[PDB]
Every structure is written in structure tokens, then in C-alpha cells.
Symmetry: D2
Subunit: 448 residues, 4 copies
């Protein structure tokens, strides 16, 4: 794709260049390829990224981490396996395809799947601005005296300098993913770090890999266990503690009949379900994604735990402990020492031990309400009284017909789980979704 | 153990000779063995069985069925691995121990684990009366003019003849397991059979294994899937239908941290938990037992399902279908034909297809309220106003100190899940429980 | 590809339309596709098949049989994953790609992989003649008075009618695969059937699936075990016997470091090795292919074997027996009965039991010397004294420069294991090989 | 068992207190136990150990190492699962039996299986002399003027002091296991260490775990891979090289039909086989034990190898390399540097790279000819001309009837593979063998 001057009115502007946005670029590429598309000027497009270059959750690129989805659900295959942008094609291009096969694995390393996506991302370098974090989407009318909005202005603070530029577009896509979630009862402290910053910020706080540190992990999801399992290797002399409110780490559900809610086609049937059944579906199918660990990592962790029992039959004296059904009441981070003091209570409804730590990893997951801050200026374009954005099946936010021109729009991606299903936040349907997105955004063009 | 004349007052009488009762016999055996017990007249004991000989759920001994618990949790090992009555010893005695090892399996076939238990059961043939189904436990006072109950009479209808005999005992144990549960909206019909009668009664109704029958299964638990998976093999020309109210068959949870609620020691900690936390524990740990299928059988079933898709892309035309999220509203069993008519509806809250079948297997699980009918005569011995039996930690039912002598008692087994945990109904703690039972029942004796 | 009139001189004629020939068609297709090839009249080509339509070893399409190679080593992916003719693309076209993924298997069913290949084969129906079995390749000179051979005539007996036609070509490819191998000490009998005819001919001999037959299997390779394992299901009342000269069925070796001899690139390094090292390589790497069973099927078979031991501790009285280290000395097939008599001896170097059977399946593998019969007329074109065809790296048979024009040639496929390695007879390198073949055959054309 | 004064004539003296000797102690214990044996003065017995306390290959107790045999083939179960000395009983005694079960593993850690055996070994501390390494077995005649030998003197150098004591016995057992094997073309050097000394001596040579060392491993068996896989963890900055003469690391064969040669009963049938068939059996069943790695560790190692390819596509620049089909011609260990220089050649029959290393681990396996040195004084008691010890089925060495009294003997253990089979050197039949040994040695006593 060719670059568009900043000054010009774009056909489409995307906020975020993670997997979801990247899949749109790919599908737009493919739709325009006469090789893959017998039908096939070029659309004027731009992607804006807070990061200085493409990375995929670098703060959680723990050594040994695997991806949790089949390599077949890559960025292109499910829409079209002929596509240039498939995992297998990427592998072939690196000279690794015969070698990957010999693993007989469906689950590449996280590190490798990032490079596949980085290899995709580099081919849209003409149309992606990096280090540009979007601070607001603002309505605009080509006819200032008229009462009709037909474009949107999107402004971003430069990460390096701080300068704010603007780029005008008819259509907007917010694919920003998630923001780190932090329990409200936790104080602000450099010792207190969220899982998303584990690889990037913990090495600078605990600079000595040799030192007898005390480290704690709050959580029982996938992040929790990866960190907890990594701490034993990365800090061999540390005493690690895993605090969780549940009784146990629970296996993630990938069973073939359950796993079909992740089918691209099921999105239509899911969307069509009532709110009662959607709330019901997500709550029953919870263990496909949330607060669950991969079985193999549970078994790996348990087996380490058992090894300690062979060495010492007294559990309180182990190096690496698990404390189930505990909440945190007080944190003391003003004591003169290098170690802050964590107070614990039974997570059961109606005073346990007190821990001293050099760091606290909080692996409490992610929220997905980040678009609100960007769209508050655009809130007055909804139907009267509507205090929440309503996404349609094509992902366009319902707006007011008399206030917004049909050419103008805003789509959301990765936040629509409550309307589209458990696959929305994930990699599952990105190939097909991207293709569908190219259909709603550019479909006027692509028909002629 | 030596036999006791019918006429005499027993130290202990057990209703039921399934695994739970059998484990008590074993533990009593072991406690009295000077080889295993340096401490060691013989207690006067009797077991009463409805069945004519020991069998372990023969109506569900489906070809290929595996047991779902480690062979280590056999009837004796966890109390004492030296015991004569371990699985490995049984295997050694059959000349199969070197051979079993080569399987490298923890899960014997159901058929084989029955023979192990049948091999145990045959060694108490002196003290077990078969074909004797217990119809009531009745209080008795050695001093008729006194207001104190010190024994219990237990009467049983002979399965062959119908005659009723009685046997007096100081202590009683009700280990009767479960009774088949049947949805109330289902009519009484020979075509309608519960999973517990699948192997024993379905061959007599559908006598021709060749014939193009239509068979249906109601359920999504382990019984459901075994029957459903067996129907394809046992009736090759039949059209099978699996009806379930859930969206999908769900994997059973055997993950190492979760599976620790099944630890013998955890029973104490569980018992000590409040009612709020117990209700909470069982509901969160649900998938360790109820409404769940073994992962391997789900995968086996799915893969068969996929094979059909390779043959025909039209799902309505498959031989073996799954109908998810459907309830049954009407059953028509008065039509002139060999086939009764099943009407279905969405199990979702607010009219689908109508099925015609030659048989309906209902795999709707088991209830465990069967002791009430036997204990209603004994209900007036509880504390004032108590309308439910309260089991203590040792499993003795709380009674009235001023109405019942300390020598006299009643214990329950396999119904106390609500107070003892998910392991109660199962094989998990039987070795240790039996040993504990021998401690409460015979512990006065065994101290001297 | 467009059809060529019979009368005209072809650029290339292939004998056989199995996987190897089919991969050449595919690679030729791809080389000529401007979509996949920016470089891209059409070559005049023809494939001649003995079978009336494409099938892939239909006589061994046993129920439940899996393929033994990754689906990635399909007919196109390793040359180019973008290709229209990949497994994943085929699946996508059938609407099964999301469904196949949920299996999380690398090994499709044999039945399914045949349909994938049948789906490929149908797209060259213009250039493939079916029911045409090739009986000889014959030299021809455009200049009869000259001493130079520049074309070859290829004649085939019509399977339906018997008529013999001829088609002239400059280049020839013999990709006929293998012929059934039969021990010389076995007499000719309809009761004696080779594994390759198991599905197609055994049902007509043993017409009653109910009947208490005695069936025997000679062999210990993959064919042996599939038949043996299938007999128990397909004939439930039969007594099956597996005779083998080895002590045991041995696991096939798919271990990642060993499995790299199957890498496309390794063919060059293998070809370059001396005869001493090649003989050495194939003999050490034997268990990657020959006389070996898949581990899972060994375990499946063993576990069935153990089930019988639980039922009867006497091994001679089992329904399904294995007789290790036995050879067959006499066969008696002239007795009046329906059952011929098999005499056995220790396969050990220096009289055991005698079996009576209704059928004998011989699973003794395949030879690959079938091209000789077709090429005997062409033998005088080799270098003086050369009594064996020498294949080059590009697979062209070395011939005499002064007797054969450079435009004229003969290539071999699937028989060159002794020079190309264990992957030659298999599906391993077909994608890449086909592409390489298109390079040697059509490379003059494709450069311009 | 009670201690015997040094001065007295013993019934039995064992050289070695590893698993084999320890199993004899256990079986003797069990035979004498009236609990396990209704039949049951005590035999006068002594075990002599070079080590200061019981350890099981401590120099190869690599972190993470698993045992390669089922826990069922422990020291007692296969003879009698009731025995006090079973693994499951040991676990129960440690309070780990419920916990071990939750692993659902048949293969305990090496570290744990050592503690089980150490827990056995501690119960014969009365009859085991530690730090006593046996230097010779010497004939003795109670009647010096007679020509009949009826006892043996056994002398041992004290490891601490050097003093030599003697103990007289009628019967002797040499269960010394194996001695480290070293290629003859390797020079004597502290940098050159055999796998058996890896954990115990390499930490003292390479004292800094941080330092960028170059380390090499010669071998492709289990020892090779464990060391190679451990080096990456234990020395994170080292460059490791695995040199092997084979093309690849090969999977160990544990397949159920093959694995039956390890059956206790098969020893009789094996022993009875001719020398031609024995040589044949061991050579065909080679991969059950020798020059083979566990599949999981091969896959683990391969996957690490692949991870490097994702980081760098140039193989020569990887940190951890495998060099297949290479032999070592010259070693240079006189250069001034800390690094000696290794020269390599193709292991193929008819000059490659030269490596520089700080250490060389040689994992070239074990020989088992160590008894000769101890028995040379006893050689004149064999039949005329016999220059090799012949073990009988009961393991007694054939001797001369006219020179040796029937009360006097010598048994061998763990060296008799050539006559008893692949299980001899291993843990497979120790339970049963020990019991059989107690039968031949003490059977006169135990009948009365
Ligand atoms: C550690 C981890 C591993 C995961 N792996 C799996 C897996 O195995 N399989 C799977 O299917 N899913 C997994 N996921 C779920 C994950 O949400 C998706 O895989 C995927 O990241 C979805 O990407 P996205 O399009 O939501 O964008 P995200 O990856 O969430 O990132 C959006 C991008 O927009 C940028 N951005 C944010 N705000 C702004 C702004 N104001 N202006 C400009 N740019 C902005 C961000 O920096 C980022 O580059 C994982 C999640 C985590 C935390
Ligand atoms: C098909 C199936 C398979 C199972 N396998 C597993 C497994 O893999 N692992 C596991 O741990 N658990 C499993 N269970 C759970 C099962 O409840 C226990 O394994 C076990 O059967 C518990 O036995 P129990 O002592 O409750 O007696 P039960 O086996 O329930 O039987 C009690 C006995 O008392 C007899 N009886 C009943 N009423 C009377 C009366 N009035 N008078 C006299 N006698 C009477 C019955 O005929 C029976 O013999 C399974 C359950 C089913 C249905
Ligand atoms: C049961 C079975 C399963 C197998 N599956 C595996 C597997 O899992 N993975 C794997 O990699 N390999 C496997 N193979 C190995 C097999 O050789 C290859 O997979 C594959 O069939 C190679 O095909 P080919 O090109 O040699 O042709 P083949 O499949 O051997 O057939 C050649 C074709 O030429 C035709 N033909 C023969 N003679 C003539 C003539 N005179 N004139 C005209 N036409 C003729 C034949 O009818 C046939 O159509 C399997 C083999 C068998 C027996
Ligand atoms: C690292 C490793 C792991 C193994 N694990 C497995 C496994 O997973 N499964 C399995 O079945 N087999 C395995 N083995 C094979 C091993 O040979 C047996 O498991 C077992 O050690 C056999 O023991 P043994 O009786 O031969 O005595 P060994 O263990 O070989 O030791 C004999 C004892 O005698 C002592 N001794 C030696 N010479 C003298 C002397 N002159 N005087 C006095 N004492 C002496 C030694 O110090 C030693 O204590 C393993 C081998 C190795 C090297
Ligand atoms: N635990 C997760 N993050 N799961 C997300 C992927 C869901 C499922 N593996 C799929 O096939 O799409
Ligand atoms: N699905 C079941 N029936 N589970 C019962 C057994 C629970 C668990 N396997 C245990 O170790 O005790
Ligand atoms: N047993 C066999 N037929 N093996 C042939 C395939 C070899 C190996 N699986 C590969 O990757 O190519």
C-alpha cells in the first residue's frame, strides 16, 4: 500500500497496529490483489501506533511461552489459505517450514508468532505511523453551517517530542486492545508491577539475578502462572509466593465441542442471541479464556511443587509457595526497608500470614473500556439518551442518521465481546473479521 | 470373618455390599490381622445385598469403558499398601501384574476393576447374605418398659421368594449408593430406559442388532457419551440422536491442584467449613464429577462426528446427530407404531424438530435420598424438630442422647457429599474411610 | 491443462496417475500460473492410468486408518504454501477448514487424504486417460535411416476392451509405484490374498460377516496390524491369527532428529554419498518405514490382547492370537474342506502348531522392479554393458549420448530409494520433486 | 537382620550394596518374615560397599532426570506387593502417597527413587560395612591337607585408612555393577571427564557458573543427552557441542510387545535359547537400552534446537550445536591455554572442524568385566581349560565338583546379560531375582 500525505482526507484511519488492525491491512491487501481477486486508485489509509515498532506484548514475552491457539488460526489462512500472509508461507520464506513441521506442534512459541506478525507488519511500513498515540477522535463537518457530520479528525501526541498533529478521515477504526487492570485496594508503588510490564520493568527494579529476593504474584490466570513459573528460573535464590483468591489453578478448556464457539461463523448466531442468552453463553463458556491456565503448565508447576515435598515434608519451609483462598487487605510500602509488607486474609466470606516482599507482580488481567476517552467528543452523535456505544454486526457504532452522513463512520475491534462473543478479544476470527471489515469500509469501492 | 447366626444380636449390620460396604469389611479384616496389626472373639457382622451376587453397575458395563480414578485409589492401598486387598496384589494373584504394568495406564477397564472387587467380595461370603433387600430399620429396646433404645431391627424381603426375615444389631450402616434419577416430565414406558439399565434391559427390547432402529440419548454426562458412543458400534444400522440442554459436552477436570479436594485428609477441613463455603466449594469444583465427560471420549466422539462431515457436508443427513440446547416437551407413546414421538424445544429461556424413536435412553444421573424410606421408623430418635439426618465427622447420625444408648447407632455412607465433599459418593477415600469406620464402630473392642 | 490429440507428438507422457505423477501435474500447473509465477503455448502432456478413476490404495482403505505423515507434507505446500493445491485450501473449499482445525491432528484419515488427492486429480481430467495400462515404452527415430533416437512410443491395453493404442512422446515418466510382493513358498489360491486386495477382494470370499471363520495374517508391518486389528471388528465371530517371523511388532520411528532424512534438501546430500554410506544410511534408518507399526496401533492391539487375558488366563483359548517367531513350511489347499491347512516352524535358525483357515491375508509388502518389463525394448539405449538403469539427480535415466538425442528422455519416480533415499517411495518430497521435475522436463520452455 | 562378628564364618558375603545386592537383602528379609511367610537362627550375612553411604549414581543425578522404568518394577512389588519394601509403602511412610498419585506418572524422579532405595538400605545398616572396597576373593580349605575348597576369604581396602581386613564365607555374591568405559584414543586429562563423574567432578574444574566456557559431549545415549541438555541450564554462557558418530539421537523402545523381554519369566526362556539366538535376541532388541535416548528428551532437545533457528538462521553461529557423524582423531592437551584442542573426522568409512574446549564430557557407557580382577585367584577352581566364568540359571558360577564342596559358591549379578538377557544389568527383575537368589543360597535352611 502507498502512503497518504498527512494533509489529505483519508478513506480510513486505524488507531492501533496490533493483530486486529494488522489483519485489516492484510485483508485490504488481499482484496486488492488481482492474483487472489479477479475483480482487482488505491484507498487512502493510515495506522497510528503508540509503540515505536511492532511488538506483541513484549512485557510478557517470557522465555518458553507458547501461543494458545492453533497456527491455522493465523492472520490469513481462514479467510484464504492461498494468501501471501499465512504462517506457513512466512515459515517457507524464512527457510523454516520443513523444520517447523518436525516439531509436530500446533502451538508456536510466542516469540516466533511475533516475528511472523512483525514480518507482516513491515510490509505496511508506508502506511503506519509509529510513536503516535491517539488522544482524541473529533467530529468535523465539510459544511460548517450544515448540521451534518461527514468526517472525523484524529489527533495524536508524538511519543518522542510531544507535538500534536491531526489527520482527517471519513471512517475510523479503534483497535487498541486492552489496558492493564489493577485492584483498587492496591497502592501506587514501583515495587508493585502489573504482569504486562514483567519482562520490561522488573529487571530494572531487581537488578541482581543472584540476590535472595522475596517476590509475590497476585493471580491465578495464564499470566500468573507464567510469571510464577518464570521467577524460579530467572531468580534462582528468590522466595516466590503465589497469592490467589480461588482454591486452585484451573485448566483452560480447549475440548473440541466447546471450542466451536470460536468458529468464525458462530459470530452471526451469537450476535443474534438475546442479551439473556449472551450473558448466559459467556458465563458458561468462561473457562475457554479467563482465570484459567494451560493444563501442561499446571502440571509443570505441580510437579515442581512435588519435587519440593521430596526435599522437605514441611510445606512452610519451601522456597516457592502457593497461598490459595487469600485476599490482600493492607500493603505497607513506607517501612524503611527494601521490602514492603503484604497483609493477607481468607478470601472466604464470613487474619492469616503477613508477607514481606521486594516486588509484587499483579497479574489481574485487562479491562477494555479505553475507547470511551477517545470518543467522548463524539458521544453527541449517538441516538438521544444513548450512554453506551452500540456496535452492529459489521462492527460500526450505531449513530444518528440525521446527524451523521452515511459515508462517515467509526468501527470498534476487540472490545465487542459482550455482543460478538469470546473470540472477539482474541486471534480466532481476525482473518475472517479483517476480510469482513474490508467489506463494510471499502465495499462501495470494491464493487466498482 | 466367621458367620453369625440370624437369631443373635449383631455388633454391626450393613445394608449394601457395594464398594463402600466392601471397604469396611476389608478394613475390619485388616484391623484384626496380627500381621498388619501387632495389637491383633471376633465381631458379629452381616452384610445384606439386593443383588444375587457382587456386581459393580453391570447395566453400564459398556464394552471399552475405563475407570476414571487411579488404580492407587483402590480399596486398600491408601490406608495400607501392605494390605492383602490391594489391586496390585490382586493382579499378582491372577498372574497379570507383569502384564498390567506394560499397559502403562492408571485407569483399568471397568470390567477388570469389577473382578478385582469381586475377588475381594468372595472372601466375605460367610458374612454376606445376597438377594436380601432391606425394607426397614426399626428401633428396639432390650428393656421394653424403659425409654431407651439400644438396638435396631433390620428386615429384608427375599428377592426370590418374598419372605421377610429380621436380624437384630446394635449398630447399622446404610451404604446403598444411588437410585436412578428420572425427569418428572417423562412418561412411564418400556421404550424409555435409564442409563443404569442400558446393558441389562436394552438388548431385550431391541432384540435385532442388525435392524435400522432410531435411538435417542438424553444427557451430556459420562453415561450419556458412553451410551451414545456405544450405540454406533452395537447397532450399526441405527440412527442415534444425542439430546442435551447444554450447548456442549464438557471435559472432566482431573488437573492436579483441583484434584486435591479428593485427598483423604481434606475431608476434615471440608467438614469444618461453614455451610456457605461448602455450598461454594462443591459448586466451584462441580466439573470434577457432574455433567462432564472424559476428554478422550469427547475427542473420540468429535472425531467420529468429523468423519461424517467428510462423507456428507449436510449435517441433517448424518446417521448420528447431536442436538444441543434442546429440552423435551411432549412424548407420544400411544401411536400404533413401534416408534414413539419425541417433541423438542430450545432449552434457552424466553418449537424445534420432532423425533421418532424405538428407544429412549435417559442418562439423567442419580439421586441419593434412598435412606429416608428405611429410616422413617427411626426418625423419632432425632433431636426435637430435626427433619433431616445430621451426619457427624465419623459418619454417625446425630440422635437424641436421652432416647438412644451410646452403644447403639446408625452410620451413613455415600450420601454425605453435602457435609463430606465430592469424594463421598466415589471410590476416592474408601480405603481410609473404611479404616475410620472400623475405628468408630469397633474401637471399644480393638483398644482391648 | 488442455488436451492433446492422441496422434500428435507429446512433450511429456506419464505412466501412472498416483501421488507422484499427480504432483508433477500440480507443479506444472503452478509453474504456468502467472499468479504464482511472474514469468508466466502450453506443453502437450498426457497421463495414463490402469485404474478407471483416481483412488489411493482402495484395497487398504481400512475403517479408521490414519495417514502417517504430516498434512503439511501434502502435494503442494512445501514447494509453495500459496499454491491452490494445498490440503488447507482443499479443506477451505469443502467448508471443513475450521472443523479440521478442531481435531488438532497432523494426521488426516486415509479416506480424507484420498479425497483431497481426488479433488486435485479431477482438475487434470482433460489430460489423463483412465483404464489405460501401459504395456511397453518403445524407441522411435524421426529419421529412420539415422542412428539417433529422439522419441518414444508408449502403448497401452484398454482395460475395458483390450484394444491397444499408441501415443508418441519425446520424454517419458514412469511413476507406477509398487507391485504386491508374495513369498515364493506360498501356493496360488483364492483363499490366499495379499494386503493390497484386503478391502476389495476379501468381502467376496468370506461373504458372511456373521460366520465363525478362521483367518490368518502373515506379517508384522503396518499392513499386517491394520488387517489384524480390522478383522476383530469386521468379523466378530472369527478366530484371527497373526503369524510373524520376528519376535514382536516394532514402533515406527518419527523422532525429530531421525525424521530429517525425509527433508527435501537432504536428497542432494544423500545422492552425493557413496554406495557404502547409502547402503549404511538406509539400513540404520530402516525403522522410519519398513517392518514397523505405528506406536498407537501397537498399544491399541496390545490392550485388546490384555483384555482377553482378563477374560481367560489361558492364552491358547483366546479368540485372537499372535504367533511370534514362526515361518510357514507347508500349505495344504487341496483338502475337501472349506479350510486350508497351514504348517508352522520356528523362524529361529538351527515343528510347531498346524493352523486351519478360511482365508490367509499375506501382508508381505511391495517390490519396485516393475519398470524393467516396460523398458526392456529401451535397454539397448544404455551405455555398453549396463544391465541396470542409472538415475541421475534430476531422475533422468542415464543413456548413451551417441544413441539418444538430448531432447529425448525417460525419468523414474518412486523406485529410486537406493539412490535418493527413504523418502523416494513416499509422499515426503513430492511437492518439491514435482517442481524439480517440471524444471528438468520443461525448463527449456519455461526460461523463454 | 543382626550383625555378624568379623572373625566368624559367614553363610553369605555380598560385594556391592547397589540395587541388586539390596534386593537380595530385601528378599532375605521377606523370606524370614512370618507375616509374609508362614514357614518362618538367622543367616550370617555381610555386604561390603566402596561408598561411605548408599547413593545411586550420584554423579549423574542431573536436575530433572527421570527414571526409565515403571515404579511397579520397584525392589519388592513383583515378588510380593504385600512386602514392606515397596515404593508405594515407602511413599505412604513419608506421607507422599496421596501426593504421588496426583502426578499420574509411572516414572519417579531419579532423586526420589534413590531416597526410596536409601530408605530400604538404612534397614540393613547392621549388616552392611561401608567404605570397604573389595580387592580379592581367595579360596580357602578348612582341611589344608585336603584337596577340597569349602570357603572363600574376601579382603577389602578401607577407603579412609587403607588397612586391609578379611571376612570368611562359604558363599559369595559379586554385585558390583559397571565400570566407566573410556575410548582408548583419548588421553588422560582432568579436562576429560566421564559421564559418571559429571555432577561430582565438573563443578570443581569449571568453578564459575557465569563464565563463557566451551564444553563438549561425546556420545548419543541417555547420559549424552542429559549432560548436553543440562549444560545449557547449568552454564548459561557456555558454548556446548555434542559430538556423535551416529547420524542422530534415536528413541528408546518401550513399546508393549517389545518390552516383554523384560518380563521376569522370560529369563528362563532366554537362558534356554542357543548362543546363536541369544546373540540374535540382544542385537535385535538393542534399542530397549543401548545408544538410545528417551523420546521426550529428544523432543525437548530438538525444540531448543529449533528455538535457536528462529533467533539465527545460520547454524554455525548457534550457542549449542550438534555435530553428527564425527569421530575424534587428535586431542591436544599440552597447549599453554585453558582450552585443549579437539580434532574431528567423518565417522563415515572411506578432515572436518577443530574444536577448542575447557572440558570434555565423555558419555561412552559402561563395561562389565570387573569381577575378573576379583576372581583371578579363584580361576583355578573352574573346569580344566575354562577361561571364562559360566553362570548357571540360578547365577552360580560353574566350578569343578572335585575341587569345590557343594556348600561353597560364588554368584554373579548384573554381568550376565549375555546369558540372562537385557534385563540383567537393570532394575527389571531384581525383586524376583533377589527372591530366587535367597532360594539358591539359603534354601537348605529355609526348607527346615
Ligand atoms: C501475554 C498475552 C498473550 C496472548 N496470546 C494469545 C494467544 O495465544 N492466542 C490468542 O488468540 N490470543 C491471545 N492474546 C489475546 C490478545 O488480546 C490477542 O491475541 C491480540 O493481542 C489481539 O490484538 P488487538 O488487535 O486487540 O491489539 P493489541 O495486541 O491489544 O494492541 C493494540 C495496539 O494498539 C496500540 N495502541 C493502544 N492505544 C493506542 C492509542 N491511544 N493510540 C495509538 N495506538 C494505541 C497498542 O500499543 C497496540 O500496539 C494474548 C494476550 C496476552 C496479554
Ligand atoms: C457407571 C458408573 C461407573 C462409576 N465408576 C466410577 C469411577 O471410575 N471412579 C469412582 O471413584 N467412582 C465411580 N462411580 C461412582 C460410584 O458411586 C462409586 O464408584 C461406587 O459405586 C460407590 O459405591 P457405593 O458404596 O456407594 O455402593 P453402590 O455401588 O452405589 O451400590 C450399593 C449396593 O447396595 C445395594 N443395595 C441398594 N439398596 C439396597 C437395599 N434396600 N437392601 C440391600 N442392598 C441394597 C446395591 O444393589 C449395591 O450392591 C461410578 C458410578 C457409575 C454409575
Ligand atoms: C496402504 C498404504 C498407505 C500409505 N500411506 C502412506 C502415508 O501415510 N504417508 C506416505 O508418505 N506414504 C504412504 N504410502 C506409500 C505410498 O507408496 C505413497 O504414499 C504413494 O502412494 C506414492 O505414490 P506413487 O506415485 O508411487 O504411485 P502409487 O500410489 O504407487 O500408484 C501409481 C499409479 O500408477 C498406476 N499404474 C501402475 N502400473 C501401471 C501401468 N502399467 N500403466 C498405467 N498405470 C499404471 C497405478 O494403478 C497407480 O494409480 C502408503 C502405501 C500404502 C500401501
Ligand atoms: C545414570 C543411570 C541411571 C539408571 N537408571 C536406570 C533406570 O531408569 N531403570 C533401570 O532399570 N536401570 C537403570 N540403570 C541401570 C543400572 O545399572 C541399574 O538401574 C542399577 O544401578 C543396577 O544396580 P547394580 O546392582 O548393578 O549395582 P550398581 O548400582 O551398578 O552399583 C554396585 C555397587 O557396588 C559397589 N562396588 C563396586 N565395586 C566394588 C568393590 N570392589 N567393593 C565393594 N563395593 C563395590 C558400587 O560402589 C555400588 O554401590 C541406570 C544406570 C545409570 C548409569
Ligand atoms: N486461553 C485462550 N487465550 N484461548 C483463546 C483461543 C481459543 C481457542 N484455543 C480457539 O481455538 O480459538
Ligand atoms: N469423574 C469422576 N467420576 N471422578 C471421580 C474421581 C475423582 C478424581 N479422579 C480422584 O482422583 O479422586
Ligand atoms: N512409516 C512411514 N510410511 N513413514 C513415511 C513418512 C516419514 C515421516 N513421517 C516424514 O515426515 O516424512
Amino acid at each position: 500500500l502507498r502512503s497518504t500525505p498527512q494533509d489529505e482526507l483519508h478513506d480510513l484511519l486505524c488507531v492501533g497496529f496490533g493483530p486486529a488492525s494488522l489483519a485489516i491491512a492484510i485483508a485490504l491487501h488481499d482484496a486488492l490483489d488481482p492474483r487472489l481477486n479477479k475483480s482487482a486508485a488505491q484507498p487512502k489509509i493510515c495506522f497510528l501506533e503508540r509503540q515505536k515498532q511492532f511488538a506483541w506484548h513484549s512485557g510478557m514475552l517470557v522465555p518458553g511461552s507458547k501461543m494458545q491457539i492453533s497456527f491455522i488460526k493465523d492472520l490469513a489462512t481462514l479467510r484464504d489459505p492461498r494468501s501471501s500472509f499465512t504462517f506457513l508461507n512466512y515459515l517457507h520464506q524464512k527457510g523454516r517450514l520443513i523444520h517447523f513441521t518436525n516439531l509436530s506442534t500446533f502451538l508456536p512459541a510466542r516469540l516466533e508468532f511475533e516475528d511472523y506478525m512483525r514480518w507482516c507488519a513491515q510490509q505496511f511500513s508506508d502506511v503506519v505511523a509509529y510513536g503516535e498515540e491517539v488522544v482524541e477522535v473529533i467530529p468535523g463537518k465539510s459544511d460548517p453551517s450544515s448540521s451534518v457530520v461527514d468526517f472525523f479528525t484524529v489527533r495524536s501526541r508524538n511519543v518522542e517530542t510531544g507535538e500534536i498533529s491531526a489527520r482527517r478521515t471519513r471512517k475510523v477504526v479503534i483497535a487498541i486492545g486492552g489496558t492493564a487492570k489493577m485492584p483498587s485496594g492496591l497502592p501506587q508503588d514501583p515495587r508493585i508491577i502489573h504482569s504486562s510490564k514483567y519482562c520490561t520493568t522488573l529487571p530494572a527494579l531487581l537488578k541482581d539475578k543472584s540476590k535472595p529476593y522475596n517476590i509475590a504474584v497476585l493471580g491465578s490466570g495464564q499470566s500468573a502462572a507464567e510469571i510464577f513459573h518464570d521467577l524460579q528460573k530467572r531468580y534462582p535464590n528468590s522466595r516466590t509466593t503465589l497469592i490467589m483468591r480461588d482454591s486452585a489453578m484451573r485448566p483452560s478448556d480447549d475440548s473440541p465441542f466447546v471450542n466451536e464457539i470460536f468458529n468464525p461463523e458462530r459470530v452471526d448466531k451469537f450476535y443474534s442471541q438475546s442479551a439473556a442468552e449472551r450473558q448466559r453463553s459467556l458465563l458458561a463458556d468462561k473457562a475457554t479464556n479467563y482465570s484459567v491456565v494451560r493444563l501442561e503448565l499446571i502440571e509443570e508447576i505441580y510437579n515442581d511443587m512435588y519435587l519440593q515435598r521430596v526435599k522437605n515434608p514441611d510445606e512452610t519451609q519451601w522456597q516457592h509457595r502457593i497461598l490459595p483462598e487469600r485476599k490482600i487487605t493492607r500493603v505497607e510500602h513506607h517501612g524503611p526497608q527494601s521490602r514492603m509488607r503484604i497483609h493477607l486474609k481468607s478470601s472466604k466470606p464470613e487474619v492469616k500470614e503477613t508477607l514481606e516482599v521486594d516486588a509484587l507482580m499483579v497479574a489481574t488481567g485487562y479491562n477494555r473500556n479505553a475507547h470511551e476517552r477517545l470518543l467522548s467528543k463524539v458521544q453527541h452523535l449517538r441516538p438521544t439518551g444513548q450512554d453506551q456505544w452500540k456496535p452492529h454486526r459489521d462492527y460500526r457504532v450505531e449513530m444518528d442518521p440525521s446527524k451523521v452522513s452515511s459515508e462517515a463512520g467509526i468501527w470498534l475491534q476487540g472490545c465487542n465481546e459482550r455482543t460478538h462473543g469470546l473470540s472477539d478479544s482474541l486471534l480466532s476470527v481476525l482473518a475472517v473479521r479483517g476480510g469482513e471489515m474490508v467489506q463494510s469500509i471499502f465495499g462501495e469501492q470494491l464493487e466498482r
